[PDB]
Amino acid sequence: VSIWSRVVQFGTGWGFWVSGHVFITAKHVAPPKGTEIFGRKPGDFTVTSSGDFLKYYFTSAVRPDIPAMVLENGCQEGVVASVLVKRASGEMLALAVRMGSQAAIKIGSAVVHGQTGMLLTQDLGTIPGDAGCPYVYKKGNTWVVIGVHVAATRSGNTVIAATHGEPTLEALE
């Protein structure tokens, strides 16, 4: 699809334009908080994190050309999604992954929640440094994004996606 263009190198990893204003990535690849990014200084944007999910909101659209997509909080187990892996070479691998159940993890010093998935099918699969690449699927007749890649199991086909879910309560003052 044209979409592959949304995926871009970022810090020590990758990230994704959900909308003109919204850029998501894996928190551990991101450059330190308050770094000048895409030629914007802090204050041009607002960053919300959620585990190892990291969302930048830009007051002014940074990618004006691009439509919004729906950003779900993970998806149902058994749904077949697809990871959009770009490699530094520019090579583009659509990896199919059947999504699984939730699962905690440690990124160093910090336990973080994710949805696991089991890569469907040699060379193949993921590497560290794919972190950030998105997981997306076709819900009925259109496409949504459900999380970002964080890591893959030493053993075989299992991968973890970080997810972002909207807050449901609020504290006062």
Author numbering: 3 to 123, 130 to 181
Publication excerpt:
We made three constructs, NS6 1′, NS6 2′ and NS6 4′, which were extended by 1, 2 and 4 residues respectively, generating proteases that contain substrates that correspond to P4–P1′, P4-P2′ and P4-P4′ of the NS6–NS7 cleavage junction. MNV NS6 2′ crystallised in space group P6122 with two molecules in the asymmetric unit. The electron density indicates the positions of residues 3-181 in chain A and 4-181 in chain B, but is not good enough to allow complete modelling of the N- or C-termini. The two monomers found in the asymmetric unit are related by a quasi-2-fold symmetry axis and form an apparent homodimer with an interface area of 1,097 Å2. In addition to neighbourly contacts made by the two C-termini, dimerization within the crystal is stabilised by hydrogen bonds involving Ser 51, Ser 111 and Val 113 of chain A and Ser 51, Ser 52, Ser 111 and Val 113 of chain B. Although the C-termini within the asymmetric unit each embrace the other monomer, reaching into the groove formed between the bII-cII and eII-fII loops, they are again not located within the substrate-binding site. Following anisotropy analysis the MNV NS6 2′ data were truncated to 3.2 Å, 3.2 Å, and 2.7 Å along a∗, b∗ and c∗ directions. The anisotropic truncation of the data, with the new limit of 2.7 Å along the c∗ axis, resulted in a dramatic increase in the number of unique reflections from 8,555 in the “pre-treated” data to 12,786. Anisotropic treatment of the MNV NS6 2′ data also improved the molecular replacement outcome, with a unique solution found by Phaser in contrast with the two possible solutions of the uncorrected data. Nevertheless, this resulted in immediate improvements in refinement: Rwork dropped from 32.5 to 30.3% while Rfree was reduced from 42.0 to 39.0%. These statistics were further improved to Rwork of 25.4% and Rfree of 30.3% in the final structure.
